[PDB]
From a paper:
Here, we show that a novel Mn-dependent peroxidase is an important factor in tardigrade anhydrobiosis. We crystallized the putative globular domain that lacked the N-terminus 62 amino acids of g12777 protein (g12777-Δ62) and solved the crystal structures as two forms containing Mn2+ or Zn2+ ions at 2.30 Å and 1.60 Å resolutions, respectively. The functional assays conducted here suggest that g12777 is a manganese-dependent peroxidase, independent of other components of the cell.
The Mn2+-bound g12777 crystals prepared by soaking method (50 mM Mn2+) using Zn2+-bound crystals indicated that the Zn2+ ion in the Zn-1 site was replaced with Mn2+. Additionally, an Mn2+ ion was found to be bound at a new binding site (Mn-2), whereas the Zn2+ in Zn-2–5 disappeared. A part of the β5–β6 loop (residues 163–168) around the Mn2+-binding site was disordered in the Mn2+-bound crystal, suggesting its flexible nature. In the Mn2+-binding site located at the negatively charged patch comprising β1–β2 and β3–β4 loops, the side-chain oxygen atoms of Asp92, Asp98, and Asp131 and the main-chain carbonyl atom of Ala96 and two water molecules coordinate with Mn2+ ion at distances of 2.2–2.9 Å. A considerable conformational difference was observed between Mn2+- and Zn2+-bound forms in terms of the metal-binding site, in which Asp92 and Asp98 were commonly involved in Mn2+ and Zn2+ binding. These aspartic acid residues were highly conserved within tardigrade orthologs, and the highly conserved CD-CD motif containing two Asp residues (D92 and D98) was used in the metal ion binding in both structures, suggesting the importance of these residues. The presence of a disulfide bond close to the Mn-1 binding site is suggestive of the utilization of the disulfide bond as an electron acceptor, which could categorize this protein as a new class of peroxidase. The recombinant β-sandwich domain of g12777 protein (g12777-Δ62) showed significant peroxidase activity when Mn2+ ions but not Zn2+ ions were present. The sample buffer used for this assay contains 0.1% BSA, and the manufacturer warrants the lack of non-specific protein catalysis by BSA up to 1 mg/ml with this kit. This reaction (H2O2 + CH3OH → HCHO + 2H2O) was carried out without the presence of hemes, thus suggesting that this protein is distinguished from most Mn peroxidases. Furthermore, we speculate that this affinity is related to the localization of this protein mainly in the Golgi apparatus since it has a strictly controlled high manganese concentration, suggesting the antioxidative stress functionality in the Golgi apparatus seems to be crucial for anhydrobiotic survival.
Author numbering: 66 to 162, 169 to 226
The structure:
Amino acid sequence: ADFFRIETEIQRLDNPAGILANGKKCDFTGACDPVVTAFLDLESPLSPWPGSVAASKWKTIFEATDQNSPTIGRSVIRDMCGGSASNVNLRVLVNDADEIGKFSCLFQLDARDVAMDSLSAQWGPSTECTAEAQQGKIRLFARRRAFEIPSTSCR
Ligand SMILES: [Mn+2]
Ligand SMILES: [Mn+2]
């Protein structure tokens, strides 16, 4: 499988205390205003956060006002073209619209994981991402799928 697509879904953020990574409240009369930026790290997945590419260069995928624990439902897509990758890491930053949490959902990419095609690429299990701070207090969940694509479709 020398040409394949990785899609990772940031499923949901849970912040019952409505706090920041520094542990104070996002909003003292309201809830967090979470802004989600993310990036699927193929080149330095086993390195410390942020990995290969700096957070400030990531695309904004989800936004919300006064929802500590929003459902997200949004994908980050990456393609491995012309060779093999053994894992990938969905690096996520969450800010209060100010750091809520830096997360890392590392994902194996063994042969098991990359389906022969898109229709046969079932989502894998929901996985909790690793946070820099507030482990278990501010949680982020995400799942992966991967499937072979034709080379002319690989970005
Ligand atoms: Mn797709
Ligand atoms: Mn707010």
